[PDB]
Amino acid sequence: MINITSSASQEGTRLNLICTVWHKKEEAEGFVVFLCKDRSGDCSPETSLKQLRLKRDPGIDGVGEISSQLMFTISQVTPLHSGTYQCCARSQKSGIRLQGHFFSILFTGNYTVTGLK
Known about the structure:
Elements: E1 3-11, E2 14-22, E3 31-37, E4 50-53, E5 67-74, E6 83-91, E7 96-99, E8 103-107, E9 111-114
Antiparallel strand pairs: 1-2, 2-5, 3-4, 3-6, 6-7, 6-8, 8-9
């Protein structure tokens, strides 16, 4: 395929939300990967928290060869970060859309991450 996966990592106070697209060499050209928060059906790169344009061959900003990764780093998790997140990718020209599983930050301060696996 070309497919998308979601993960997260935590270090000190920082929380990193990770969207990874797996793709054959060259297959990702024309794709954009983007992280959306609490968008009921208008998630796009323009309304995303962060995006990355993928490219035909490796570069030095998260575009790799058989996979590419977008990372969104939260310095410290506050109630502003509470809500539901989704990794997405699209190719405008192919009409391909890849959607990850919804996952949540729940701020209680202290927080949980749920819905990854």
